[PDB]
Amino acid sequence: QFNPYGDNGGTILGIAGEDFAVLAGDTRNITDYSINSRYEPKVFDCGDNIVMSANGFAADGDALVKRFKNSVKWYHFDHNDKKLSINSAARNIQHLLYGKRFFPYYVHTIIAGLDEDGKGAVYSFDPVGSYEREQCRAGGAAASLIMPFLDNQVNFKNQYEPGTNGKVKKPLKYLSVEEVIKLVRDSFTSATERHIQVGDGLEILIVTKDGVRKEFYELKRD
Amino acid sequence: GYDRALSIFSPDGHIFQVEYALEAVKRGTCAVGVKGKNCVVLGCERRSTLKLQDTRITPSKVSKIDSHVVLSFSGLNADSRILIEKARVEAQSHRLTLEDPVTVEYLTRYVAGVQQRYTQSGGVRPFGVSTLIAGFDPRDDEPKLYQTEPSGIYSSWSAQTIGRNSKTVREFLEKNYDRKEPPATVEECVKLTVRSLLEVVQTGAKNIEITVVKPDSDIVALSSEEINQYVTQIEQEKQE
Amino acid sequence: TGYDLSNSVFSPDGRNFQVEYAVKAVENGTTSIGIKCNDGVVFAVEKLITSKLLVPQKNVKIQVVDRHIGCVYSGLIPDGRHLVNRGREEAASFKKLYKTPIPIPAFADRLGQYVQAHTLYNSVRPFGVSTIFGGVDKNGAHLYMLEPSGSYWGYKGAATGKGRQSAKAELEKLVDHHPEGLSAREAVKQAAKIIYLAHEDNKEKDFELEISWCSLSETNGLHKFVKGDLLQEAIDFAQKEIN
Amino acid sequence: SDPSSINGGIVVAMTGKDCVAIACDLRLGSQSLGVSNKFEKIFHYGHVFLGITGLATDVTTLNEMFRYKTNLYKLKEERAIEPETFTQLVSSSLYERRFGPYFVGPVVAGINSKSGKPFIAGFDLIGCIDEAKDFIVSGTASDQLFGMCESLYEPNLEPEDLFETISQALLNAADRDALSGWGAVVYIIKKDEVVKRYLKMRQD
Amino acid sequence: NNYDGDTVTFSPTGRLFQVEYALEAIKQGSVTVGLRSNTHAVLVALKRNADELSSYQKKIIKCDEHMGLSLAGLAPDARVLSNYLRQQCNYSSLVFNRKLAVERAGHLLCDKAQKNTQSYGGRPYGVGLLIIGYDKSGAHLLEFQPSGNVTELYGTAIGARSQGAKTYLERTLDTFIKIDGNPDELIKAGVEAISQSLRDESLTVDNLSIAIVGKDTPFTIYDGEAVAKYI
Amino acid sequence: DRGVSTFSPEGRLFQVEYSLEAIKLGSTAIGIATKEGVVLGVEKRATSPLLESDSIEKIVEIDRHIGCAMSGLTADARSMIEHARTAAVTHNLYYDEDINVESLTQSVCDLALRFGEGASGEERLMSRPFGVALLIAGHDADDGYQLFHAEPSGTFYRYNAKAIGSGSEGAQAELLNEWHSSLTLKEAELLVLKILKQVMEEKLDENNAQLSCITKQDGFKIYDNEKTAELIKELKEKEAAE
Amino acid sequence: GSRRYDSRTTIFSPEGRLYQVEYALESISHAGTAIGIMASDGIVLAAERKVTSTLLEQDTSTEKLYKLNDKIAVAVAGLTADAEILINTARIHAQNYLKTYNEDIPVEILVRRLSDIKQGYTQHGGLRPFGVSFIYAGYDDRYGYQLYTSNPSGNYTGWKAISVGANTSAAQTLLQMDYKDDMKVDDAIELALKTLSKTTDSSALTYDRLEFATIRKGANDGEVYQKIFKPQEIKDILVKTGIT
Amino acid sequence: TTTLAFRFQGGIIVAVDSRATAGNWVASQTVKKVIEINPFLLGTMAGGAADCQFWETWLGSQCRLHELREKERISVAAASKILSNLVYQYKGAGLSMGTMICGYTRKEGPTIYYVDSDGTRLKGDIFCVGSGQTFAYGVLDSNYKWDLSVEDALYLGKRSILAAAHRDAYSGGSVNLYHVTEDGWIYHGNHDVGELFWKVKEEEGSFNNVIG
Amino acid sequence: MDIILGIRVQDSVILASSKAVTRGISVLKDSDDKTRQLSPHTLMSFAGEAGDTVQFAEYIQANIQLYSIREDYELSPQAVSSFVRQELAKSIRSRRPYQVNVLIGGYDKKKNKPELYQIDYLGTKVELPYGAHGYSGFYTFSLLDHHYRPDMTTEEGLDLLKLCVQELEKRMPMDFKGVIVKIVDKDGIRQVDDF
DSSP states (O other), rough: OOOOOOOOOOOOEEEEESSSSEEEEEEOOTTTEEEEEESOEEEEEEEEEEEEEEEOOOOOOOHHHHHHHHHHHHHHOOOOOSSHHHHHHHHHHHHHHHHHHOOOOOEEEEEEEEEEHHHHHHEEOTTOOOOOEESSOSGGGGGGGTTHHHHHHHHHHTOOOOOOOSSOOOOOOOOOOHHHHHHHHHHHHHHHHHHOOOEEEEEEEHHHHHHEEEEEOOOOOO | OOOOOOOOOOSSOOOOOHHHHHHHHSSSOOOOOOOOSSSSSEEEEEOOSSSOTTTTSOOOOOSSSSOOEEEEEEEETTTTTHHHHHHHHHHHHHHSSSSOOOOOHHHHHHHHHHHHHHHHHHBBBBOOOOOEEEEEESSOOOOOEEETTTSEEEEBEEEEETTTHHHHHHHHHTHHHHHHSSSOSSSHHHHHHHHTTTTTOOOOOOOEEEEEEEETTTTEOOSSHHHHHHHHHHHHOOOO | OOTTSSOOOOOOSSSSSHHHHHHHHSSSSOOEEEEOOOSEEEEEEEEOOOOBOTTTTOOOOOOOEEETTTEEEOOHHHHHHHHHHHHHHHHHHHHHHOSOOOOOOHHHHHHHHHHHHHOOSBBOOOOOEEEEEEEETTTTTEEEEEEETOEEEOOOOESSSHHHHHHHHHHHHHHOOOOOOHHHHHHHHHHHHHHHTTTTTTTTTEEEEEEEEEESSSSEEEEOOTTTTHHHHHHHHHHHHOO | OOOHHOOOOEEEEEEOSSEEEEEEEOOOEEEEEEEEEEOOOOOOETTEEEEOBHHHHHHHHHHHHHHHHHHHHHHOOSSOOOOHHHHHHHHHHSSSSSSOOOBBOEEEEOOSSSSOEEEEOOOOOOOOOOOOOSSSEEGGGGHHHHHHHHTOOOOOOHHHHHHHHHHHHHHHHHHSHHHOOOEEEEEEESSSEEEEEEOOOOOO | OTTTTSSSSTTEEEEESSHHHHHHHHSSOOEEEEOOSSSEEEEEEOOOSSSTTBOOOOEEEOOSSSSSEESSOHHHHHHHHHHHHHHHHIIIIIIIOOOHHHHHHHHHHHHHHHHHHSSEEEEEOOEEEEEEEEEEEEEEEEOOOSSSOOBBBBBEEETHHHHHHHHHHSSSSHHHHHHHHHHHHHHHHHHHHHHHOOOOOOOOOOTEEEEESSSSSSEEEEEGGGGTTTT | OOSSSOOOTTTBBBHHHHHHHHTTSSSOEEEEEEEEEEEEEEEEOOOOBOOOTTHHHHHHETTTTTEEEEEEEHHHHHHHHHHHHHHHHHHHTOSSSOOOOHHHHHHHHHHHHHOSSOOSSSSSSSOOOEEEEEEEEEEOSSEEEEEEBOTOOOOOOOOEEEESSHHHHEEEEEEETOTTTTTHHHHHHHHHHHHHHHHSSSSSTTTTTTEEEEEEEEEEEEEEHHHHHHHHHHHHHHHHOO | OOOOSOOOOOOOTTTTSOOHHHHHHHHHSSSOOOOEEEEETTTEEEOOOOTTTTTTTTOOSSEEEEEEEEEEEEEESSOHHHHHHHHHHHHHHHHHHHHHTOOOOOOOHHHHHHHHHHHHHHSSSSSOOOOOOOEEEESSSSEEEEEEEOOOOSSSEEEEEOOOOSSHHHHHHHHHHTTTTTTTTHHHHHHHHHHHHHHHSSOOOOOSSSSEEEEEOOOGOOOOOEEEEEEHHHHHHHHHHHHO | OOOEEEEOSOEEEEEEOOEEEETTTTSSSOOOOOOOOSSTBEEEEEEEEHHHHHHHHHHHHHHHHHHTOSSSOOOOHHHHHHHHHHHTTTTSSSOOEEEEEEEOOOSSSSEEEEEEOOOEEESOOEEEETTHHHHHHHHHHOOOOOTHHHHHHHHHHHHHHHHHHHOTTTTOEEEEEEEEOOEEEEEEEEEEEHHHHHHHHTTTTTOOSOOO | OOOOEEEEOSSSSEEEEEEEEEEEESSSEEEEEEEEEETTTTEEEOOTTTTHHHHHHHHHHHHHHHHHHHHHHHOOOOHHHHHHHHHHHHHSSSSOOOOOEEEEEEEEEETTEEEEEETTTTTEEESSSSEEEEEGGHHHHHHHHHOOOOTOOOOHHHHHHHHHHHHHHSSSSSOOOOOOOOEEEETTTEEEEEO
């Protein structure tokens, strides 16, 4: 019987700070217990400082990325080359996702960029097709190994400030560029040994006001 | 068409279809109506001169689309067997989908939109019958009177005369009838309609059709004995 | 009168007026000819050069159906490329189901379905082009010339365009040269000379030599365009003959 | 499971000498729950009487569809439809839609107005040609009337003697069936006259 | 003479007169001049308006990053064909994962334009188009005509007084071909050619529109002060 | 009088050329695009005192920040308004962004440039190509206030001050010298009523005329007869002083 | 130039009324004369057939009398080709109402559905509008007996007594002075027979060439019974009236 | 997932949660299920996540068409009936969802409706949708009054979601109290249950099981 | 569930519809109108699957009101059940089955006699002096036949309904929180709020 949607693995983590918003994901592509490709980039730039990555079945994500590019390029055709905001492209994706609702495609899409105020904004797309504005969200089977850890070092959840017992917790503090990179490197490194689909090497795309910078990090191939 | 082309414009900017569609209204029966403060009076002219006509079985030229919204036209009764039925279907559809009583402005756009659709569509002609749409504001006593023309447009009129001798009757609406101070009662609104009819009508029992629409879904036809009542008051002014 | 008003209507003279006007549209243009030999077929057509702004090896109108069928037309340019684009989808339909190249004797019927029908239907105007196609199949070499009226015939040689009258008399002389037909390279040299003699009316503007042939000798059943030294060999040979 | 077995009901018809008698029951109900005790299966059009069992909703649906076709025949040929010709009309109507058929037991009976011969016929879910000069019976309780109506069958029965013959077998079949009962009616047709009698049985 | 109102009847001349009536819209329309090379391609088009306060609408429509065109002729027949080429460029870059060929795009436009003219009634396309694009074979310019002919040239000019710029392009053709890789020489070459065709009209930054596309330089629309240096 | 596939000797279409003259037979619609807003005005054309002016309008609303104006036959205009309002909620849903005024007109002109006598190739909804003209006005977050004119006879153009209708010949001559970059909101409203009163012989009041404007703060707001009468009385004070 | 009005009927005529309808009125006058009368005790329908001499058998075949139902009856005067389409169409619409609602269809609703068919031809497409005139005679439980007239324009109006064919205005004058509210069934038979003789050029009007049908309320239980009178019974009508 | 709504003389108080659970692991605690059609109406989200997000926005674009035609504020009964007709025509093909139509206007006053994917429409006052809907009817109806002030209604809505999100493992995150006034909607801010549960047990003294 | 019961007395027709609408386990609302008013002389209820019966009686009411305006005459209640049966016959044969029951009753002005028709979810027209639906009708079928007579007035039918509803809620655990009774007589629709 034909399988409606498969799972090749992979883990994507979006992060939005007080200034920039980054996005990452691994290069490991596997099928069951065997590795398919050692480095397959799953992350590409869609333009206008909007980086889209789909975590889920491959061809469903491939058909989503290829048709999203033709939708953005058509947006500039009728509007005579006007910039597309990240909040504008987030709604148009669900319209493409709901049209296929009769043949559900399983994908987790996380986009990164900047809003009209300049702050980093991340819009995560559920496999049902709904989305919501999220400060930081992961995806895939390893998302459970990430999400509770970042809330400790970012949102400072359930961490009290030294000197105050049973009163208030540590207030929200902003992190620099290097501090966010250390959060990304340590997230996939610990998930490399504890998850079979995390490993190989890491592609970090940093989206700032000056442009988009791509950074490579090497995980354990095992 | 074999080799022929059906696109018609003409250098005057007015197609021959609408030019000759208004002639059917002018050569047909005359219609007039007056919107008062508390009520809307719609007059209609029928021809009883033909032998052995039964009014009860004859469909009335004044049709009721909604409880507070009625309709009256002037022209051939053949084109009215369709356009009127379309407004009746939309009347039940507006009360269903929107859970709203029929809007006089919205229903007027649908009636005028049927002819509007056929003007732009090829191989089809618009209805050459002009309808007078009269209705009330839902949950309000404010009366509303609109006009529909074969050109596919609608304009709001407090008093209007269409059909044969239209401009002749309009002279009476500009003198005896005043918009700044319209007749408050029902009898004064009917008297202006009776005075407007007898020019092209000249009394008759079945030749005068006047439907007075009142709020709270109250509609009653003018009795035959009350027709000569207003005519008697008109003849009293001629003796002076 | 109703005679010449609408097309696709019979005439009292037996010939429809659209047929005579279609030939005049074919006569106006370049001169296209063809030669059917024993080992294959040879196509020759004039390429009109309006000015030096044209880029060579670009606007060439000869299209090839699969590898075994060449096509060339003389007439309205959009109607010529439109008929070839139809035959491509027509020839691909036979190879799809039957898995075999379409035979040329039956290939004229696939193109005839569009031409013969448009003459019958009023809503669609008939094609104003004369298509000359040919090649070599399992049944041997074949050469056909399709008329705008829908009729077609096979020819050992054919001439269309303005110079079709002077070229047809020259093609009959090649029959007396060899009873079995000229060779592959021998026909190219004789075809170019016929082309150079047809520029008397076309001498007002520049022309470019255009020759394509399909035979079993060098190409072994393939249709290719003359290039390399084979192009310059036919130019210098026929240039001394017209001297 | 079977929609026709939910409502139940039977239609029995017998022959005679220049006489036909068709009868059904009055019982209408869904499974163990009853609905109407006055329900009448047989509907009369001209001299052709057709009873219908099965789903009660479709009994009227096809009857309104049968009346749709039979009226067009009278408005053209200007005479009533014959039971022999009306038989193929029902068989073609049930066969019109093969997928998702209708559950019906129809049994037609009557006397020809032209030739003057008795004719009875019956159908199945999708319709069939069934001609038996003895009797035609359908429905859930029909299993009881195969041997009862045959042993009581005699050639050339009088209209009144045929009444007591079909009634005796019909009354015993009602008490022995849970889906049959609540009285019954018998139509006795001599020539131009139809005798409508309500049978008196023991109701629950 | 009823053959001017019927497109399905063969004229005694041998070709419909409605095409010649459609050719007048190109001459009465905007005047554009363009040229290309083995590296880049340049199109210089004139923008017009109906009032002094009316803005100048762009006559250059971008259907691709590496491919563009310019329209001179009727308005409706232009943008409708632009959407067809826009879908064909996206069809080849998706299904075939390759840029649309310049010759394939010309054959598709001829089949769509002839389908309306050959059939009874329809919508005849009377607008001319100059299409430029870059691929593995280099820059190509194919002149689109309403008669159904598409020819590839190094450059040409259409519109009113087209013979003024056409004469300059023929004598200078050997010079423009040898010049490649320099956008300054290719853009300035089109300015001197259009100046001969324009009569009683000044050359400003808002009137002229210059666009160049090639291997090193993608398609960019030069407006305002962008053409102040080249003009 | 000619066919659909026949071209005029100038190269245009007969149905396109002949429909252009039908615009000048309609009502006068004057509007001006300034830096503080786009001020529009219309002349309903009341031929009888028994013609309600408050119910009928020559100015509809395409979007909260995007207005519109009509002139001539109001039949084919309403069919174009529903097509613009359909495309308004279409792009507002997908991209959740203000409708581009330049792109909105281009989408309407695509349906405005199609016509024919019918055929089996595609569906023909057009007997004649919209012999009515519309004035599109809106505000953009990139280029600011934009005022276009929807032209069924060709490509739409952006006019800072545009006047159509019967008085299109005399009103456009004054729009050239009376328009500059320092025009404010109040000066633009008084200039429309001043030019309309000169070209039209009918007395200007709050009945036969209706005014509207487009401001990014308040969106689309229809000026009632009370505010319209105050602007006319204020305009008469400047005419008597000069 | 021109190239219009020669195909589609949607283009209006210079007089505002389609000339195709005017030419359909002339075809009605070329047919026979059918005079209906609406009364409280029933409706009388009579007409004179076009076919003549001895060759055609006029007993069995009647083209001017068709039965839609046991109540609604029609009288066909006009072209037969355009009439036959609505004959089976009205029978479908009448039985569909009897199928869905299980009731006798009213004349006002039935004719309205048939009137839109004639109007749809002049509305959409260039199809020919029906130029045949129907006389609808039916009985309802609300308004009682209803008598209308189907015009080729696509409308219908109520009529107590209507006449078609030649002398249309002359027949309505004779029926006006002879109209009575107490008129019985037999009183409407003689006056309609004498009026038909004067309005037609043939005063003979034998039993075979004339068709006569009358709906009577005096049937059993006051139910509507349509009795088609054979020409053998029509011959006895001339004896009672003393004309023949 | 706990979504409750009720109306009184002052207006309508809308109390939902922020929790959206996928399987046994909470996907995100910042998810906001409040959908805004027009400034005067606020819709909820239940059942299908993308079904409520797509159709409530498509209904908003449909209501904007009527605002440009009739030039009248969209009534609560107008938008609720259009949504009921869309889900009824597609019934049987799947596409199951649920929500509560809520709005406060001058013409129709405060009104709350419930729309089901099967096409069920209902008129009333108090409505709640979720797995913890049993906690809402118990806590709300205790202090429910027609003269109840908006300030005290917000304090009651805090403990209503707190008691609902307590035993229910699928309800949680931040409590959202949003009230629609005569001039439009007003956000009162996100109130996290973790910070709210501390002030309730210390002041009101409820939840005797939890220490503190 | 969704009890709808009715009985035809001598001078009128007594129809009762449930109030509380229970969605799933919990009760969403205790007061709702489960019936629709077609004409002033005709009252019809609906019960069945949630959302199918609500939308069913709407367009049926629109078609009856539309057909009544065309003829300027109110559709007779006897022909109403025939039109409802025609739609219910096509619903079971369509791709989506619809199970809808209705009680169609009223006062015919032509015959000056009341009529009551009972139709189950199968769409079968049945005329009975009393009727009900759901599992609640099983108790009231044998009780009304033993007591009610054709000579019973309207006032006695109201007190008899109180005895039936009291036994339905006492024997069966379900609670509908009362029923809405509307008297249909020559004077038109008359609601009763005492229940």
